[PDB]
Amino acid sequence: NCYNKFAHIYDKLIRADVDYKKWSDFIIEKCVENNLVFDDYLDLACGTGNLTENLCPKFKNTWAVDLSQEMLSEAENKFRSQGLKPRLACQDISNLNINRKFDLITCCLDSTNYIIDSDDLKKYFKAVSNHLKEGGVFIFDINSYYKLSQVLGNNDFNYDDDEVFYYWENQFEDDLVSMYISFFVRDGEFYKRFDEEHEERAYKEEDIEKYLKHGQLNILDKVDCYSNKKVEKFTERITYLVKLGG
């Protein structure tokens, strides 16, 4: 619960609009509306498994993939303490290589935005469709173009609750947002530092829709941050629901 603890802090302070149960329930709900057979589940970019632990128990076989060895280990400890046994694999989403097909594939927490190269994003969607069972569903979200370009843009911010301190600087340029964040977490009489630096591309729904089709994937629904609400001009998080089209 160390890097796992930090992961919660991050999602609660930086993301701010994340609710595990809410999202997982929304996903299950959509799975049911699609007569899905809960046999095989794959969660890409599972991180420390905060979303996997909610959906994993609803399926027979689960696979969790993430590039961070550090995080995989955390998720593994979590899964274990919960009697969960999902198959793990450290791989880059752009080059997903798992000999297995699934009913449900998830990729949440704006992970898709980390693929800043349009080509790698195409490979990604193609990779995904190559792992979807016929009739299977693929659910993923992204930070909206408005969220990264306006709401984030170039705004530096300081936060100071008496247990966690952080300075977050945003640099927006040419559809790419660079985030530099220094965390200082309380650990008794001392603090431990955490420097996080991520880069996300601001993709337009028009571009995503095009890149999706390129992956032979069809859109089943496009909503506002895991809910039935429709996407609007100021939406900050878009949740896509797709399936194998061809």
The CATH number linked to 244 is: 3.40.50.150
Boundaries of domain holding 174: 144-203
Tokens in use for 156?
A: 């530096």
Same domain, 171 and 115: no
The verdict on 159 and 119 lying in the same domain is: no
Which amino acid type is present at position 31? Answer: C
Strand, helix or coil at 245?
Answer: coil
Structure tokens at 76: 């593994």
According to DSSP, the residues that pair with 184 across neighbouring strands are 165, 193
| Residues 166, 84 within the same domain | no
Q: Are residues 229 and 150 in the same domain?
A: no
DSSP state of 88: E
**CA-to-CA distance for 68 and 61, rounded, in angstroms?**
22
Amino acid at 199: E
Residue 184, classified by CB atoms within 10 Å of its CB into exposed (0-12), middle (13-18) or buried (19+), is: middle
- Please name the method used to determine this structure: X-ray
**Identity of the residue numbered 238:** I
The vertex-201 CA angle with 227 and 232, nearest 5°, equals 35
Considering the domain architecture, whether residues 139 and 43 belong to the same structural domain is answered as yes
In a shared domain, residues 51 and 150: no
Q: How far apart are CA 170 and CA 206, in angstroms?
A: 25
Kindly state whether residues 189 and 212 are assigned to the same domain: no
Domain match, 185 and 215 both: no
Rounded CA separation 108/83 (Å): 23
Domain total of the chain: 2
Same domain, 130 and 171: no
Same domain assignment for residues 135 and 151: no
User: For residue 180, what is the domain's CATH number?
Assistant: 2.20.25.110
Indicate if 64 and 86 belong to the same structural domain. yes
**C-alpha dihedral over 180, 232, 174, 125, to 10 degrees?**
90
Q: Where are the beta strands (DSSP E) in 162-231?
A: 164-173, 176-186, 191-201, 217-224
Residues 138 and 64 occupy one common structural domain: yes
* Closest among 27, 65, 61, 60 to 49, alpha carbons compared: 65
Nearest Cα neighbor of 48 from 98, 104, 112, 2 is 2
